[PDB]
XYZ file of C-alpha atoms in Angstrom:
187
model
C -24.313 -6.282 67.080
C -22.059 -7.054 69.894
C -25.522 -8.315 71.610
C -26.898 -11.496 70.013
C -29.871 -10.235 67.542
C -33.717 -11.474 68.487
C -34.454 -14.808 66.984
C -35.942 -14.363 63.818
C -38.504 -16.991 62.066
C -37.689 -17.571 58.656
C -40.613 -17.906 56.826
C -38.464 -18.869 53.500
C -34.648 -19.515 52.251
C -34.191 -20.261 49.231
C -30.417 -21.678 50.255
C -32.799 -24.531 51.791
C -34.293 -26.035 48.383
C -33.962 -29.454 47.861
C -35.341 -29.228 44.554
C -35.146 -26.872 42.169
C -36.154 -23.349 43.414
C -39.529 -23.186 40.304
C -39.503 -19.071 40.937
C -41.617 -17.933 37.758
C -39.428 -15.550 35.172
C -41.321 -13.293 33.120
C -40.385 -12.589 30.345
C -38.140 -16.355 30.029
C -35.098 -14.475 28.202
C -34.665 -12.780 31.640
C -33.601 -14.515 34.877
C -32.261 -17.704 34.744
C -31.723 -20.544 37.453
C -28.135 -21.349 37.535
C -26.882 -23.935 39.894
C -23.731 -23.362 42.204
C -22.743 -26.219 44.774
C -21.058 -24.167 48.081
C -18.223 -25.388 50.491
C -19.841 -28.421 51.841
C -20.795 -29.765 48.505
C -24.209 -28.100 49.406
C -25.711 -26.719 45.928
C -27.182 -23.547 45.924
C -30.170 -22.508 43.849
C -29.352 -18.648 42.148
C -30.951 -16.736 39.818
C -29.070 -14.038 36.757
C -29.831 -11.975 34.117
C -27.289 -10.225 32.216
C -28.872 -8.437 28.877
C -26.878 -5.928 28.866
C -26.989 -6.026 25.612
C -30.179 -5.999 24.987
C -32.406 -2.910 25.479
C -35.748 -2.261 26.910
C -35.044 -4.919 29.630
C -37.726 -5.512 32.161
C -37.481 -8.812 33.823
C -39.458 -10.346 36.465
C -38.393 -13.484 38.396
C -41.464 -13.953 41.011
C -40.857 -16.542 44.269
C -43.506 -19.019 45.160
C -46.471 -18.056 47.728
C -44.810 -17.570 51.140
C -47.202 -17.447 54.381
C -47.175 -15.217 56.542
C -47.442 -17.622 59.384
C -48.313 -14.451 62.031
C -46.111 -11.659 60.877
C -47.230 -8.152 60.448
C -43.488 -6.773 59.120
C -41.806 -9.363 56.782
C -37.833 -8.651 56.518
C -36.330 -9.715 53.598
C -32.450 -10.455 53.193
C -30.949 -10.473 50.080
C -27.440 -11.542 49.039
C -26.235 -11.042 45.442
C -23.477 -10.405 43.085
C -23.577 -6.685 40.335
C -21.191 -6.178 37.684
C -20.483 -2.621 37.641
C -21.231 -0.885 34.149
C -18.260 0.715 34.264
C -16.150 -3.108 34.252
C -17.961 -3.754 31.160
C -16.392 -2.941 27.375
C -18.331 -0.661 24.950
C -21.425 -0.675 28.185
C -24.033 0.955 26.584
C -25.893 4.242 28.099
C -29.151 1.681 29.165
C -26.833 -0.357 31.602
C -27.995 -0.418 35.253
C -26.490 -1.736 38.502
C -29.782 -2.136 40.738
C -32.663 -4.215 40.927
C -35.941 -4.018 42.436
C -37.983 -5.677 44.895
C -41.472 -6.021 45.333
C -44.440 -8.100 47.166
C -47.673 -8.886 46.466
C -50.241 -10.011 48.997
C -52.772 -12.873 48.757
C -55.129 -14.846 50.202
C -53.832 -17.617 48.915
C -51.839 -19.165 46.048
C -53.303 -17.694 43.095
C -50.821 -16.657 41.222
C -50.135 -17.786 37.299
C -47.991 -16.843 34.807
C -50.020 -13.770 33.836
C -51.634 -12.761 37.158
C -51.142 -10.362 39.081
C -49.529 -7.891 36.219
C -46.104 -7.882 35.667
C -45.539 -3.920 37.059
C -45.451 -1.746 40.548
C -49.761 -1.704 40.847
C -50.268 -4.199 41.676
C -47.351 -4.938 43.431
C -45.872 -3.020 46.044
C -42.171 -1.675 45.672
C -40.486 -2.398 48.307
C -36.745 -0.673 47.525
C -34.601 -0.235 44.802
C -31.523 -2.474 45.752
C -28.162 -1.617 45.089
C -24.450 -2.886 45.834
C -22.547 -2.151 48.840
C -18.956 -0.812 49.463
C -19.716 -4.022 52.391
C -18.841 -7.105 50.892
C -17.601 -10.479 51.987
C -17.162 -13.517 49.480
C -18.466 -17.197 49.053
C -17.389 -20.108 47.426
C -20.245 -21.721 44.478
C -18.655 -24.410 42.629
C -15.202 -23.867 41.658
C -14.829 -20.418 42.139
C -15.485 -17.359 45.341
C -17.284 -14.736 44.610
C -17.649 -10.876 45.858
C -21.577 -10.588 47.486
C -23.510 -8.015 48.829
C -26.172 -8.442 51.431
C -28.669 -6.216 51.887
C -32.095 -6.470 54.187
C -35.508 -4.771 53.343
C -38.439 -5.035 55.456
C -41.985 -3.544 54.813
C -45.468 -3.725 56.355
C -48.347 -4.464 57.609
C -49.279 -7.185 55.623
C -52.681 -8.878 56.197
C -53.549 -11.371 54.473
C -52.584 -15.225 54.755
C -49.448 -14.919 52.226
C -47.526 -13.060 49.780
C -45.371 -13.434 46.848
C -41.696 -11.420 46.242
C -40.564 -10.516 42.561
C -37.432 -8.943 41.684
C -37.141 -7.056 37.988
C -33.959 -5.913 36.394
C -33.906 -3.184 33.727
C -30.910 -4.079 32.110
C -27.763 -4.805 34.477
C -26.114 -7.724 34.696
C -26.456 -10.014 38.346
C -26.468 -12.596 40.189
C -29.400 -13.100 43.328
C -27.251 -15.716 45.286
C -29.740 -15.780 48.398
C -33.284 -14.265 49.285
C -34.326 -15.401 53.217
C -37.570 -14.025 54.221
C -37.881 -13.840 57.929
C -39.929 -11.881 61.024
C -38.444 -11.157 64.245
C -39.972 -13.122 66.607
C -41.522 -11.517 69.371
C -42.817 -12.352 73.423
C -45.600 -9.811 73.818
């Protein structure tokens, strides 16, 4: 990256809500929004779950219907915060340090709080996600942060939109940032 990358089209950022972000958690214990204003007094819209504690975790937090707006390869960039088992006192033998990401194509926006399924089939794993040794920081209210950044991409994808969904199993995290984008391309 010495070269300046392609211009990419961001189909969604969730660092660009005016209102509140209204991603669907399943089960509601799970994910929770939690509001951090940045630098410029800008407030940023995150999502974490931390049941450590708690076992047989399986939380969903699904984003609203994206379009695809032309794409055939969606690339999805993901910025977040893991507390590593190991930091945490008495961590039981259930704790993870990963997340998962998935998508689900539609037609259109059809989704409700029971459909599709809350597993992999019908949606489409993209990756299992995990934290870096490449971090940088940011600043979300008072305090700065250390965040990971990771980018997925998968594909095709046909129809006119899709949803994302990410599901921890029983870590404890914070998804900062999710920007969905395709690189835009001169044929």
């Amino acid at each position: 990256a010495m070269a300046i990358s392609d211009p990419e089209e961001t189909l969604m950022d969730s660092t660009t809500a005016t209102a509140e972000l209204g991603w669907m958690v399943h089960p509601p214990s799970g994910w929770e929004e939690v509001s951090g204003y940045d630098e410029n007094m800008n407030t940023i819209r995150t999502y974490q779950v931390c049941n450590v504690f708690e076992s047989s975790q399986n939380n969903w937090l699904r984003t609203k219907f994206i379009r695809r707006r032309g794409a055939h390869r969606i690339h999805v960039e993901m910025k977040f915060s893991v507390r590593d088992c190991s930091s945490i006192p008495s961590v039981p033998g259930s704790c993870k340090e990963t997340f998962n990401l998935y998508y689900y194509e539609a037609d259109f926006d059809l989704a409700t709080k029971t459909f599709p399924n809350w597993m992999e089939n019908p949606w489409v794993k993209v990756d299992t996600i995990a934290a870096d040794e490449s971090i940088s920081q940011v600043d979300l209210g008072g305090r700065v942060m250390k965040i990971n950044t990771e980018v997925r991409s998968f594909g095709p994808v046909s129809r006119n939109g899709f949803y994302l969904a990410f599901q921890d199993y029983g870590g404890c995290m914070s998804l900062i940032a999710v920007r969905v984008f395709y690189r835009k391309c001169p044929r």
